Amino acid sequence: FMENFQKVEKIGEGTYGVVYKARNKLTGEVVALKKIRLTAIREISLLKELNHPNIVKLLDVIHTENKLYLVFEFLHQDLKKFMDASALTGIPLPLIKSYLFQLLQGLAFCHSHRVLHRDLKPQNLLINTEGAIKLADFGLARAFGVPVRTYTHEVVTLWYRAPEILLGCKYYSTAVDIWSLGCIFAEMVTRRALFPGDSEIDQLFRIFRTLGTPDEVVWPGVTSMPDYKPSFPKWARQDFSKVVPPLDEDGRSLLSQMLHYDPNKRISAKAALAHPFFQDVTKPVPHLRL
Numbered sequence: 097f098m099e100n101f102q103k104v105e106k107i108g109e110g111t112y113g114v115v116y117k118a119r120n121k122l123t124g125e126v127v128a129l130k131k132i133r134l135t136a137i138r139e140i141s142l143l144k145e146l147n148h149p150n151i152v153k154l155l156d157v158i159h160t161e162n163k164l165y166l167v168f169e170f171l172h173q174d175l176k177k178f179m180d181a182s183a184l185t186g187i188p189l190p191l192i193k194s195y196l197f198q199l200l201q202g203l204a205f206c207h208s209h210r211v212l213h214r215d216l217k218p219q220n221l222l223i224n225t226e227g228a229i230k231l232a233d234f235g236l237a238r239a240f241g242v243p244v245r246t247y248t249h250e251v252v253t254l255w256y257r258a259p260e261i262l263l264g265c266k267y268y269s270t271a272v273d274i275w276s277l278g279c280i281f282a283e284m285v286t287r288r289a290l291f292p293g294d295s296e297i298d299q300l301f302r303i304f305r306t307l308g309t310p311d312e313v314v315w316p317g318v319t320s321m322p323d324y325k326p327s328f329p330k331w332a333r334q335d336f337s338k339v340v341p342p343l344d345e346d347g348r349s350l351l352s353q354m355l356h357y358d359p360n361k362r363i364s365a366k367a368a369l370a371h372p373f374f375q376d377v378t379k380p381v382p383h384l385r386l
């Protein structure tokens with residue numbers, strides 16, 4: 097239980113609980129220990145075996161008393177800090193293309209196992225010095241939920257929420273992760289958030305002003321969604337060439353397929369891996385200081 101870990105420093109404050117960098121007192125292993133404060137047992141245990149090089153490995157699930165502990169492999173930096181440190185020059189496109197490629201591999205692995213992330217964002221994308229990028233906070237959303245406030249009452253960001261979630265879809269699909277990854281794709285290219293909304297209706301309207309207000313033509317059945325309103329303002333679609341300059345045509349074509357309104361038209365992770373944008377994909381080494 098907690099005795100075998102030594103708390104090094106606080107990493108971050110997730111929704112369910114606090115995450116610490118810790119040292120296994122017996123094996124010297126440096127891990128990320130998540131303290132979740134209090135069905136879910138069997139759902140978390142289904143993630144012990146969701147192992148993939150682009151998924152942060154869940155090492156052990158400690159269950160003692162009314163406190164639940166998750167032990168992950170430790171990574172030193174999230175994508176958010178790397179984007180901030182690269183804000184002046186921009187992440188080089190070969191590195192952007194490599195991160196997107198690896199995350200689509202990770203997504204394709206979890207969607208084939210019917211596991212959704214439901215909350216992709218730069219803050220839970222972790223990188224190392226070797227050029228790898230991994231998905232974190234994976235599978236916990238179905239185990240507890242995606243609440244509005246964290247345990248430290250911080251607001252959950254909506255910038256990467258798929259429109260079907262914002263429109264009240266109860267049973268969304270794997271396409272919600274492709275949408276979030278598309279928004280992260282755009283943010284890495286332009287060094288600015290694609291849809292930085294501070295409310296659910298502001299997030300939805302910021303999507304509408306960029307991609308046009310959806311209708312039955314582009315999204316069959318959107319007018320029947322639980323939170324759709326006919327009184328939605330009707331904005332025209334902006335051209336993608338102004339959305340993410342100076343991304344090349346391969347990248348803009350891929351991004352537009354990741355940002356399709358209709359979840360059934362949105363490109364899958366496996367299909368996106370065959371997109372010509374990755375014809376020249378490599379694995380560069382990032383410029384990190386730890």
Ligand SMILES: C[C@H]1CCCCn2ncc(-c3nc(Nc4ccc(N5CCN(C)CC5)cn4)ncc3F)c21
Nearest residue numbers: 107108109110115128168169170171172219220232
């Ligand atoms: C993604 C994090 C965010 C914390 C809450 C969600 N969660 N659950 C586990 C981990 C985790 N985290 C790490 N590494 C790490 C991550 C972030 C940071 N900080 C540095 C200081 N910044 C101000 C914020 C980011 C440091 N280290 N490795 C492995 C992991 F499973 C994380």
